[model samples]
Structures are given as structure tokens and as C-alpha cells.
Target chain A: GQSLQDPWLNALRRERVPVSIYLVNGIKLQGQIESFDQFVILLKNTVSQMVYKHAISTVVPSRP
Target chain B: AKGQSLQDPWLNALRRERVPVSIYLVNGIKLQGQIESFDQFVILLKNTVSQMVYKHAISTVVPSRP
Candidate 1:
């Protein structure tokens, strides 16, 4: 099972929203959510990279 | 984890055993994992690592997740 954050994240994806994903490693990433499921998210970073979902500590959506 | 209050059922249970907890922060920050060693103000969540959530920022905690 995953966190109930699915809908919140899914909405962001549908909107093609920009989000900041903070990882457990204490690194903050600037990216747009490319895709997501319950466990992990595929985020396209500013430099255009793909990575883990469960590694995220938190997700912050941009004001714009 | 919808509209329920964060009145301690979650933390109280965590103090017992390793129950997976999903914490939703008011600022839309979500921290989901398992834990133990929680003070009244903060919680130490463990999976392969450790993290803390301030109780004030925390909106609610669920015994399980989605």
C-alpha cells in the first residue's frame, strides 16, 4: 500500500504541474512530475532526468 | 486519513510496534513510512533511514496507508 497522496499527485500530473520533490537524502529537486503511481513517481528534472518515487521525503508544488 | 483528527491514536500505536504511518502535513508535505521513538513535538520515522515530522505541521496520521 501507498500513502493516500495518490490523488494529490495524480492531479498534479494531469495538470502537468511543476513540483519540488524533497528526497530522504536531504536533497531538494526541481522538476515537473512526468508520471506517478502509488509507490514511486517519475519526475523530469530541470536538467531532464528520471528517478525513484519512494525515495521522496515530500513533494511541494510550485505556486505557479 | 481523510477528515480524522491527529489526536494520538497514530503515535500511540506506533509506540507499540512497527506500524506503517503516513503523515500528511498542512503545507501539503507528506511523509510516509514506519516508526518508533516519538516525542510529543516530533516523530522519528524509520524505514531504512530516519526522519522527523513536527507535530504542529502534521495534519493527521494513519495506522496504514493507501
Candidate 2:
């Protein structure tokens, strides 16, 4: 149902990098890109982590 | 620190090469693009789409994988 390559999504689908998403309320989530839709992105925070669509403020590759 | 600009780290992050960042908005919106421009308040993110985002509305910035 898509016909384009999103920069991050492209990486998500192709790689197993840790994607960190920080919320506006001051919460930071770090984990692999599990999946996503038009609203939310599924993340496996060590097999037990997550974030909502409305709760996110920004996202980046959590690399050190 | 006294008399600090508070713009060094943030500025450096955006000033250098196009740092690919995934900018998430307050409205559950996600933008995948490189930082194009910033003026201490808003940043011009240019990717497949161009968007001007206020610094306040942004929670944090995530650096791409190195």
C-alpha cells in the first residue's frame, strides 16, 4: 500500500539498528524498529518496549 | 554556566553535513530528512518533503546511525 522509500523506514526495513524515539513529555525510547503504520511504530525494547503515535516528539538512530 | 549561548551543541548538530534525522512532531507525525537550515527557533527539514518545524514543538533530535 506504499510506493515510496521513507528515509528512516528504509533503514528500518533493511537494517537492525536501534531507533530511539523521544516523547514530548520527556521520555526516551531505544530499541530496534519493530514495525509501524500511519499512526504508531512498533518497537521491541529488548522484547519489551513500545511508544504511541501521539506520544512521540522525535526519533533518531541511537548510536554511540 | 553564565552567559552561555546554549546554541553551540544544537547548532553544531545542524550546521555540519546534512545530518539525517527522524523528526517527530507533536501530532504523531514522523519526517525522515536531513537538516537543511535552522535559525535558533525553527529548522528547515528537506527530504522528499519540506517542512518548517518550531523548536518548541519538537521534543528531541535523534542522530542517525554512524
Candidate 3:
């Protein structure tokens, strides 16, 4: 089954959108979403951070 | 080996066992309920009412029992 988030994430990746991801721990990460799978998202900025999906609270795009 | 999601088995186990769970959201809301059912993006939590909690909004899932 396809996750509800995959399409949204794919669209953001395709458009190369800048995003701010908020974690449950109240940490904020700004990056471009390089790639994602069921378990993690590879967020790229100067470096890449493999963020776990469970730790994420929200993903806000710079544009929308 | 089956590539089951890390979350599914845990949720399923709680559902099967009728475990009461404490669900903490990223927004700092803590809800207590039983796991009625769940999907990729949503969990149906039931207590007095049914709450459709989006998985993305969730921070943690803590069961009442060890």
C-alpha cells in the first residue's frame, strides 16, 4: 500500500522545494528533501541528515 | 524476511492485546485511548469517542503497561 505522505514528499522533491521540518522534540531542520522511504528521509542541506519518520511532526514548504 | 513497517507490528500488538496507550502529539497534546485501528497515515484511537490522529502529528506512543 502507498503511504499518504509519499506523494506529497515526492512532489516536494521533484520541485526542489525548500522545507522546514519540525520534530516532535521541538527541533527544527531546514533542508531539501533528497529522498525518502518507509523508515527515513534523507534531508540535504550542506550535509544530509537521515531523519526518522517517527520523529517528524510536520513538514512545511517555503512556498506553501 | 518480510519488510513490515516498524510501526505496524507495534500497533497491531497493542490492538490485539487491548492495551491502553498514551499517545503524545508533537503539539504537546497527550491522549489516552486504545488503538482501534491504523493505516499508513492515521490511527483510530477510541475511548469515549473515536479520534482520527494523523501519524505525522504524533510524537510518541506509550502503552500503559510494560
Candidate 4:
């Protein structure tokens, strides 16, 4: 199948992670994972941490 | 608050590093785009340095210790 030729599919194969790709309305879609909900949670945590760091760095110091 | 000098920080930093600094300002207003702005600023810094050297007519480098 042409799936082997796809970059994302190849990466998944290299990582030994099972994944399926679908095409709908000329847009390529990847399979959703409910079992990887922990990964999604971790990603949200990481994003929040980055936002907090950016805020802290950009905030003006209070005058003494 | 005291008004800060409009002097270029990059040029000042270079001079502080003991590098032979030159300052020039490009006169043409036609090149006023983002990339052109950088070019003009560089030209201006170089011209300033050149004027100082010519006016002093000194071969040895002098520091602007104002």
C-alpha cells in the first residue's frame, strides 16, 4: 500500500507504533487514540508550563 | 524620567569590546524598508567613525570617552 511511502507512516513504523491514516475530503487524517489520553494530558501540561515561563520572563519588575 | 540617547546600542557594544567602530548614516530615503533600515543604520555608524578619523587626522585609534 502507498501507506509505506508516507513520511508520518514511516516514522510510526520506525518507532514501532501502530497507526492508521485516512483521507477525507482531500485532507489526510491520522487515527485518533483514546488509550493515549495520558500523552494528551502531558502535552496540555507542557503547553501550560511554556505559557507560564513566557509570562514570567516578559513581566516587568516592580519598582522598589 | 531622563530621555534616553538615540545612539545605537549595537555600535556602542562593539566599541566597548575595543573593536575599531565606524558609524555612518545613508542619506537616501528610498531604501526605508525593514532590511534597508538595518543597512542605513550600519552606513551611518561607519560614516561617523570615518568623520572622526578624518577630522582628527590621527593614525592611532582614539576612544570617545565622553
Candidate 5:
């Protein structure tokens, strides 16, 4: 498939950009992306949180 | 080669049939429209107006009849 999601996340991961992610329930989280696969994103700061793609609402990087 | 994504055919079917859909967003918003177009990251939904909804924010897509 022509991928849009992977490339965008890979760019953020490679550049070590900080991100603020909003969950479906409106909780906001702060981290850098550690890794990701089809179903989950691994986010890291002092610790790592495995966020499911289905539970996510938005991923906002610090810069464009 | 660009492989067919799991979602592509399903969305294409709904678009081709002009079926009305009820899309539920993870944020608890419900949107009603027909599938105009979609790619890996977003869906263009057409109703009285067009809405470009990010795929990550979506939770469910329910066809009006089936």
C-alpha cells in the first residue's frame, strides 16, 4: 500500500521530535516516539507507553 | 509494488455503492456521510458538506443498512 502514516511517524522518530498525543477520551500525553508497528505506537519519555492505534485521536509534533 | 490495504476495498465498496455511513470518532463524535475518497491517513466524507476526517481519530464506520 501507499503509506502515509508510517512515513510521517518515521520522520518524527528519526528526527527525535517531541509529540503530544491526544487519546479518544481527551487525555493528552507527551513523549518521543520509540517505535511503532501496525497496531501500536511505543512512546518514550522517562518511561514508555504503548498506545494502540485504535485508541488514538491525534498526534501533534512540536513543529512542522 | 503497492499492496492493497485491508481497508481500501471496504471503503471502495461503500463509495461505489453510494452507501450512507455513520462514522463514529474516538472522541465520541458521530458523523453521517458517504465515503467520497480515502487514502491511508484520511477519509473525505460527503454529506451536505465535505469533511476530511483523519483515520486515526475514527473508531467505527457503520453502514446505514448493513
Candidate 6:
């Protein structure tokens, strides 16, 4: 199924907003956001998420 | 290209890149004057390049347009 046609996508589309994907060297690169200020917030959130995930992994190592 | 001599190193680099650059002035148009000019477009062009060098710290891509 195409993610572009998913329900969540439809909701965003209904608001007249567009979704676009940017690729580099044929690889899809994730974009946090366009606005600089929003990007900073996104970066902080990403770092926090990574730390939280790593902490859990350290406490309970994944089975090999 | 405005006020730039052909001997300028930046001009030489531009030639190497084959970058299409030009300066324009309004000719007989209303307000008939220079509309766009750049003595060192290469220096201005470097801004975006420099931003890309540290792009990982910043998520957004800076626009590189004259």
C-alpha cells in the first residue's frame, strides 16, 4: 500500500498541505522540517528519543 | 561579475566549474538602471556551501539563490 494514500496522509492533504520526498544519490533522506526554529526542536526531540531508547537497551540487552 | 577583472582567482574557479553567471542592468526599461550586480558572486555562493559543511547540526537547507 502506498503510504502517500494512507489515511494520515489524507488528513494532511485535506488541510491543503503537500508532502514531498527529497532524495540524494537515489537514497531517501529524512527531513526534520523546513523552518529553522522547528528544526532545532526536532533535533532536541530526536536526541532525547535516542537517549531514552539507548537507556532501555542498556538495562535489558536484546537476545542474540 | 561587476567590477571584476578576468585575472581574479574566483573568476578562474567559476570558469572551471562552468557555472553560468551573468550581471544584468535594465536597458531603456522604466527605472533604467542596474537591477542585479555582484562583484564576488562566488563568495556569496560559498555561503550555501559553507552551510552544507555544517548541515548535520542544522536540519534545514539554506536557499542558494541570487
lDDT of 1 by residue, B1-66 (tens): 122122244355566777677665656576778867776568788766888766656544445622
In each prediction, how many residue pairs overlap at the backbone (N, C-alpha, C within less than 3 A)? Answer: 3, 0, 0, 13, 1, 0
Per-residue lDDT over A1-64 for candidate 6, one digit per residue giving the tens place of the 0 to 100 score: 4442234423432443322322222222222221111112111112110011111111110111
Candidate order by TM-score, decreasing, is: 3, 5, 2, 1, 6, 4
Better of 3 and 4 by DockQ: 3
Model 5 residue B50 distance off true place after TM-score fit, in angstroms: 0.7
Worst 10 residues of 3 chain A by lDDT: A44-53
The total number of steric clashes, by the backbone 3 Å criterion, in model 4 comes to: 13
Per-model TM-score, in order, reads 0.42, 0.45, 0.54, 0.16, 0.51, 0.18
Q: Write the per-residue lDDT of candidate 5 for residues B1-66, one digit (tens) a residue.
A: 123432565568888999888876776788999999988789899999998998787755667754
Query: DockQ, in order, for the candidates?
Result: 0.03, 0.06, 0.09, 0.01, 0.08, 0.02
Interface RMSD of each: 13.3, 14.1, 8.5, 26.0, 10.0, 21.3
In candidate 6, what are the lDDT values of residues B1-66, reduced to their tens digit? 111222243334543554433211112111111212223222222321321122122122211121
Model 4 TM-score? 0.16
lDDT of 3 at A41: 68
Against the correct fold, how does model 5 do in TM-score? 0.51
Residue range A2-29, candidate 1, lDDT tens digits? 5557677767878888888886667677
lDDT score, candidate 6, position A50: 8
Q: Chain A TM-score of each model, in the order shown?
A: 0.75, 0.72, 0.91, 0.22, 0.95, 0.24
Q: Which ten residues in a row have the lowest lDDT in candidate 1 chain A?
A: A45-54
Task: Give model 6's DockQ, 2 decimals.
Answer: 0.02
Off by over 4 Å in 3: A1-24, A27-37, A40-64, B1-3
- Native-referenced DockQ of model 2: 0.06
- lDDT per residue for candidate 3 within B1-66, as digits (tens), equals 013444566578889999898877767788889999988788899999999998777765667764
Kindly give the stretch of ten consecutive residues in candidate 1 chain B with the minimal lDDT sum. B1-10
| Top model number, TM-score | 3
- Candidate 5, residue B31: Cα displacement in angstroms equals 0.3
Tell me how far the alpha carbon of residue A43 in candidate 2 is from the true structure, in angstroms, after superposition: 19
Rank candidates, DockQ, best first: 3, 5, 2, 1, 6, 4
Q: Candidate 1 docking category?
A: incorrect
Model 2: CA > 4 A from native: A1-64, B1-7
Report lDDT (CA) for all predictions. Answer: 0.61, 0.59, 0.77, 0.22, 0.76, 0.23
Q: What is the C-alpha interface RMSD of model 3?
A: 8.5
